[PDB]
Structure formats: structure tokens, C-alpha cells
């Protein structure tokens, strides 16, 4: 039975200590400020960050002129720059370890829609993205955790078929017009 060969994986991990106030409050700060739906969204960002940090630490352990260090360091730095996760002049691979989960959270399409105007709020931005209302280059994206790249940050705008940047009105805007007539 082929299709048994399709891979799949886990994206987050629960905390070792269930109830500690300090972590609880620190996590709720982020879940509120960035308008996330639950702790799992924060924990998957942490897990992705821990992956990239283990890679960076391994490459930093080796010695320069090691072609693995060279090749993978250039690739990892390019990946970090491509998503705006790293300022200019920072391509030293020690500034990857300094990178924070707030930086990943800052690149989600929810946060960028809020930060670009268009939203008036962080929760308005989410409900705006999950209602087919926002496009990136030409495509209607409705996943708030899209993680835009720095190149495509310019072309974000409203959809051509949402009332707020497109064409025809919605259910209720038409419904009131018909009952009015």
C-alpha cells in the first residue's frame, strides 16, 4: 500500500513544567499582543526557532574553512535574510543565535496586515485574513500564519473580490438593499 510512504511530523512540543507563573505570563503576553489563538501557535514558533538555533550552534562549533560550515552558513543566512529575520550587515551567523521568537511572530501575515494599516486591530486583522479578504502577490491567502518574505512585503493588498479592496458587496450589504427596495 503506497501512500504509507508519505512523511509527516510534529511541529510543537508541550512545556516540561505545566504550571509555572513566570512562563505562563510571559506566554500570555505574546498570545495577546500578537493576537494568537492558543498556546500551540507560540510553541510551534519556539520549536522552529530551536531547530534553526541547533543548526546554527552546530555550524558555529566547527572551524571556518570547513566547507560544510561555509555552504550551510551561507544558506542559513540567506534563509534568515529572505524572511527579514535579520538586519543588514548581520551575516555573521552569530547573530542568528541572538534571534528571538518575537522576530518570527513579527512576520506573520496577521502582524504585517495590522502594521500596514488595513486592519485597525490585531484581531480585526486575523478575521480579515480568514475571510478571503487579502492577497499577497495575486493569490487569496487565508492562513494568518503565512510568514511573508521581505520581497513580497510590498505586494500585499486587499483581494480583488472582497468589498474592502475589490468588487461586489457582501451578504448583508445586498440583503439590506433588497429589503429596502
Amino acid at each position: 500500500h503506497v501512500n504509507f510512504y508519505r512523511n509527516y511530523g510534529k511541529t510543537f512540543k508541550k512545556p516540561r513544567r505545566p504550571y509555572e507563573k513566570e512562563r505562563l505570563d510571559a506566554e500570555l503576553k505574546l498570545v495577546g499582543e500578537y493576537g494568537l489563538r492558543c498556546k500551540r501557535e507560540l510553541w510551534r514558533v519556539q520549536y522552529a526557532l530551536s531547530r534553526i538555533r541547533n543548526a546554527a550552534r552546530h555550524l558555529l562549533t566547527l572551524d571556518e574553512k570547513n566547507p560544510r560550515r561555509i555552504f550551510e552558513g551561507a544558506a542559513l543566512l540567506r534563509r534568515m535574510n529572505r524572511y527579514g529575520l535579520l538586519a543588514e550587515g548581520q551575516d555573521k551567523l552569530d547573530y542568528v543565535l541572538a534571534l528571538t521568537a518575537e522576530n518570527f511572530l513579527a512576520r506573520r501575515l496577521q502582524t504585517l496586515v495590522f502594521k500596514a494599516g488595513m486592519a485597525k486591530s490585531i484581531h480585526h486583522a486575523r478575521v480579515l485574513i480568514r475571510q478571503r479578504h487579502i492577497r499577497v502577490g495575486r493569490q487569496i491567502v487565508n492562513v494568518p500564519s503565512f510568514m511573508v518574505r521581505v520581497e513580497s512585503e510590498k505586494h500585499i493588498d486587499f483581494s480583488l473580490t472582497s468589498p474592502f479592496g475589490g468588487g461586489p458587496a457582501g451578504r448583508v450589504k445586498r440583503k439590506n438593499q433588497k429589503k429596502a427596495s
Binding site: R53, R57, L60, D94, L97, A98, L99, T100
Partner: peptide
Amino acid sequence: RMVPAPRGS
């Protein structure tokens, strides 16, 4: 015992 750690760890 305290051992040095990589930055951000």
C-alpha cells in the same frame, strides 16, 4: 556546576 552556553540558549 555552571557551564558556558551558546548565546540565546
